[PDB]
Amino acid sequence: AGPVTWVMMIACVVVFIAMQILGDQEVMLWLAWPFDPTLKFEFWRYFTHALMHFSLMHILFNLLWWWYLGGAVEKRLGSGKLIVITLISALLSGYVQQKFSGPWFGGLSGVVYALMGYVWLRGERDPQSGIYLQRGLIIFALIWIVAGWFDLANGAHIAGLAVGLAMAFVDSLNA
Ligand SMILES: CCCCCCCCCO[C@@H]1O[C@H](CO)[C@@H](O)[C@H](O)[C@H]1O
């Protein structure tokens, strides 16, 4: 797995540990989306919310998905491609989550939705390239989506998905 796939995974584990130790609240105090005018200009906060996870279950699956999809995109398409997908989806989903439900949140699932969308759409319009989303894995990706949609936020997730579909569109549009 590439340097980008790895660094993100390691950081999510590190933050998660910092969260078990000092408690979630303390960590969010520093990494969460600005929750006061006084934090307005602390720029890392527009991205660092994707690094926090609140349950073993979430970071486990988010990282599995990230490891499979992110790794595939970085290897066949390059680190740069994964960095842009992650940056834009993290900002957009973070923004939509923030707008309808407040600054207290976290998770890499917004970015993960960008990846599922991207891998699947490129692999359907530009078969040729090695990046497609396995038939069986489309089924388990759906189950995962379902788990999330029926709370077993959805807006933040569609925004993440929208960034991925948009980018696969643009790409499978070059040639
Ligand atoms: C979707 C994943 C997003 C991850 C984004 C991580 C960005 C971390 C930016 O931190 C910066 O690191 C510098 C290193 O020296 C500090 O000096 C500076 O104060 C701090 O702002």
Curated annotation (Swiss-Prot):
It is a multi-pass membrane protein. Changing H157 to A/C: Loss of catalytic activity. The active site is at S109, H157. Residues 23-49, 98-99 are periplasmic. Rhomboid-type serine protease that catalyzes intramembrane proteolysis. The keyword Acetylation does not apply. Keywords: Cell inner membrane, Cell membrane, Hydrolase, Membrane, Protease, Serine protease, Transmembrane, Transmembrane helix. Its EC number is 3.4.21.105. It comes from the Bacteria. It comes from Escherichia coli (strain K12). This is Rhomboid protease GlpG. GO terms for molecular function: endopeptidase activity; identical protein binding; serine-type endopeptidase activity. Belongs to the peptidase S54 family. The keyword Transport does not apply. The chain crosses the membrane at residues 2-22, 50-70, 77-97, 100-120, 131-152, 153-175. One of its GO terms (biological process) is proteolysis. It catalyses: Cleaves type-1 transmembrane domains using a catalytic dyad composed of serine and histidine that are contributed by different transmembrane domains. The chain holds residues 93 to 272 of 276 of the full protein.
